[PDB]
Amino acid sequence: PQPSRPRKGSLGFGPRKRSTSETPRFNSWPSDDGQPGVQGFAGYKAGMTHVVLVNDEPNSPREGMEETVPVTVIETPPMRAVALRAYEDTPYGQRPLTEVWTDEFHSELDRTLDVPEDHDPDAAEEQIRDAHEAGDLGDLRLITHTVPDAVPSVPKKKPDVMETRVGGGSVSDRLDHALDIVEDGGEHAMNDIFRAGEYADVAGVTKGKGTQGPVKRWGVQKRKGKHARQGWRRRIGNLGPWNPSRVRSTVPQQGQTGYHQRTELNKRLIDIGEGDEPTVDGGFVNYGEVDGPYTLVKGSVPGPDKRLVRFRPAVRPNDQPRLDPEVRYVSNESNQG
Amino acid sequence: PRTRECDYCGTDIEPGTGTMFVHKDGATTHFCSSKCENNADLGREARNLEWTDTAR
Amino acid sequence: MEALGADVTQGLEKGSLITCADNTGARELKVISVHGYSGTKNRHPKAGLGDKITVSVTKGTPEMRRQVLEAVVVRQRKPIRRPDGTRVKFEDNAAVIVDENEDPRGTELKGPIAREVAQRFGSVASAATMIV
RNA sequence: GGCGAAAGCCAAGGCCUGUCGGGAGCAACCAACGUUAGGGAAUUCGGCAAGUUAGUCCCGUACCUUCGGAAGAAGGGAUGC
RNA sequence: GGGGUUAUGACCCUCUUAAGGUAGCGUAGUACCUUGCCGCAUCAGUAGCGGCUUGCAUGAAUGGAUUAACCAGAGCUUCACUGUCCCAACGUUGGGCCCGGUGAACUGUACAUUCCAGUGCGGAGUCUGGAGACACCCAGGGGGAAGCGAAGACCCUAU
RNA sequence: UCGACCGAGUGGCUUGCUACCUCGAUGUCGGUUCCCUCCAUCCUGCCCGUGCAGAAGCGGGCAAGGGUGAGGUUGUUCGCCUAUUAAAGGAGGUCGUGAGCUGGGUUUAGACCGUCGUGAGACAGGUCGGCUGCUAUCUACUGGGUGUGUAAUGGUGUCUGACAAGAACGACCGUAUAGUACGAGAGGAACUACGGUUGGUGGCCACUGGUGUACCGGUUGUUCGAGAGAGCACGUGCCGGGUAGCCACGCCACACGGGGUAAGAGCUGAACGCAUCUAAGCUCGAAACCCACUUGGAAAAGAGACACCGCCGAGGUCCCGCGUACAAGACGCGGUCGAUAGACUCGGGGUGUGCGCGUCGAGGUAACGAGACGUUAAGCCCACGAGCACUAACAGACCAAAGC
């Protein structure tokens, strides 16, 4: 009597509404086991191509043989860690304490912030160290931003600004490590945080679909057979039982679909290069040509071309890193045709 | 990546693309594209198609 | 089961009529069920290359007809994907009758078998003329 | 045009009055439609809806029958310039 | 109906009430038991067809049986076909959405931002206890207002 | 393990009883679609007993997180049957769900048969046919805006996390273990480590596939005298191919572990000098709970934190060119110190070799001639990219930090 079947779509990604921030904000950070280091990076989505690879999986019967793998090319020029923020531990949880800022700024950063003309870094740094001595110091993160002007395919000169955690080492060593990076002007690269063959989590705001119906948005069935000709095609049977007499939020309905934040786990970094190697004949469709620092990600990444995406080291990897996998071939074939 | 010619038009098949059709008798045909498969399915011979490397 | 070493889009359903490629005297087979398979509400049980299926003999010798047997799908029209990315597809859909031990019921196979079917059933591969 | 007072296209003649317009690749959803790989009635009370077939000529045509029919049975081939 | 005496069945009776079902057909558009039993067909067939048939309650112009041709008549099978289905996608035209102009109706005891429970003429937005709840507006698909629409056709009652 | 008699109960899913609610109407059965729940648990996890050697079972405990599917007859619910399966559990939500669908059955008006009736007609007996209204005021929810409060000084950017949601994962097969332990043999495991499949989930479009009334070609009828080049044939005449995009049939990703427990296994340990897993104390132990992970989240009225900028000016709105965005609104980018859009050119793509002329051409006195070859990877076309300030991003307008 009515075979069962799972509900339509997950309830874990709700409410499905427009993201308030087109720059994604990481909900979690990797653990502190390693040496002091910045816990993420960012870049701009270009497109897709494929790659022939040598299977490095020790547990595959195909180990050593060639495999074709899909890749999303992301332009990953260096970013600037322009400040160091410290969090205090309080009964209400973590709160920003103070910030140590550089005096050295990229020319376009004033399109976004009101850049400090007058700051006292040492005072801030002192406040931080006093906190550490009191054992109230709870976290250390860098205020960082991208340099889209270094990516001509992307129309924006206005930088995207995001805060990224610094993990690893003792708190003291971590503090020093953070301060060293910032004072320079903060310039750092994909090279510095990530190595090819490692797993990253990639976060991004998905392609916007605007308003869509429950069939697309939730995966409910279309009306079937005779039912499909009666005046109803794409609508669900009912909004609920007689009682409770109200519509539950769990029933699939139309609404904003796409343009949500997603964090996708365990994305293998196939290569971190620079130059025009990955670029496709004719240009990446609706994007442009890539010549410059880039990252190849196994498979797919959330978002349309030009969208900012964020990297962090995998917080829950299934597999051991197999470093620097061998790339036999990278297709430059036109994506038109 | 061993490069193969398309058994129809004769251009080099891009690695990691295309389709092999296995015939009834076990003979084998590598196609570089749908365009070529479909042209073949019309019973057209590539040597008679001017745009084809074979014909050229 | 053992990995096929290929990704399959199942091209067959419960009820599909396919070729019996072998000398058993069964000509046409009707798919009934798919071994180890569980579907979902309204979904037609689906079978493809390398699956073991329960089968019914629709066409053939009087003694083979109406019999319910097991078989293995050795060819399908819907493409499969090989690890180099290329697709492979056949001229028909074909299965080979097999016993409880997965040994072919007949002494001879008719036409090509897909290479991946060897990664599963040795006895069937062994009896193959051509493997592609 | 073709068997045609058929279709389709076009004269003569009539009309732009089956009388509200402007804008958004113009979203969801609905009306009326086109195409849809592999499978091929598994759908459903039920092939409902849709699809298949199709004009003409030649070959050929079963059971049954009130000898009139059944019959365009079925099936096969041809078709332009 | 009830009794005497070589497939269907035969003959003689009795009783009611005149006769006592012939030729046929039969689980029927008539068969309660019933998805009757056997067979065909299907992987599987309360269906369909054939045979059997004691027929709850068949049968001879209350016409019986049967039947070529005919049928927008009821049921079933096969080939072919296919978006009916697996499982949905994209596209086309008119709407929908925004703007100018035109411009109704249904409905309205009052109050009303509700939800979970309880209670109550036993099926509450309004009572009781809690929970939740900043206001206004746009689009949606219709869960609830035992939604709107019709002094219930059912059922009983009316000298 | 099965378990009579008799005795005591629990549920409110059947059936019956009652006649309390509605006859100025609370739309039927079955099905469907979509959501939530219960546990008396079918599978899965952890256990106990066994008439527990193993394997396969049987019975029981905890446990509702997830799963429990596809078909043949029948309107059926139910049930019968088939092949699969880890298993193909059972209930409640107005016998959930007709301002959602369907309309096969019950139960209108037509008709037939059987039975009953003198008859009109009847049956609860069978049978063929037999309709599905409404523009949403309130409430409810899914999504999108505008305001106010926080704030007797605004703004830019970055965060916090009270709380809220999730199944974000469930399950199976195979290999090594191992023809090993166990067993006379027949037969035949496990821990662990691997590989894959299935169902669910979120995203993506290099690959394969669909679309693609952009585009290119072929061709039928007709009209523009022919040619060339075109219109119509339903919103492409038809056929062949198909770019971008959008898509699934394509591709990528989706857990360890820790903490606390249930059943259970135990430790120490009295009451009760012994014994005792329990009374105090403790060690362990479920797919369940909590954390972990993903999503939302300053209106959290204790209405938050940090840094800088600004209070005659920070910043914002309007405007203009656009689109990583979009039903209005919103959102995001660019605006000459500029590649934001268009033109042009090149690149990268689609089609498949243009008009004209030359030669050939079955033939025909000739006229004429379907078609073939060359010129010609031609002609035509592009939703993409680059180069390039040539055109257009001009001109600008406005709000903005209150009082004793």
Ligand SMILES: [Cl-]
């Ligand atoms: Cl439906």
Ligand SMILES: [Cl-]
């Ligand atoms: Cl991993």
Ligand SMILES: [Cl-]
């Ligand atoms: Cl099955």
Ligand SMILES: [Cl-]
């Ligand atoms: Cl239905």
Ligand SMILES: [K+]
């Ligand atoms: K009533």
Ligand SMILES: [Mg+2]
């Ligand atoms: Mg209807």
Ligand SMILES: [Mg+2]
């Ligand atoms: Mg492409």
Ligand SMILES: [Mg+2]
């Ligand atoms: Mg290609």
Ligand SMILES: [Mg+2]
């Ligand atoms: Mg179903």
Ligand SMILES: [Mg+2]
């Ligand atoms: Mg439209």
Ligand SMILES: [Mg+2]
């Ligand atoms: Mg199809």
Ligand SMILES: [Mg+2]
């Ligand atoms: Mg077929």
Ligand SMILES: [Mg+2]
């Ligand atoms: Mg069916």
Ligand SMILES: [Mg+2]
């Ligand atoms: Mg069905």
Ligand SMILES: [Mg+2]
């Ligand atoms: Mg029809």
Ligand SMILES: [Mg+2]
């Ligand atoms: Mg019968």
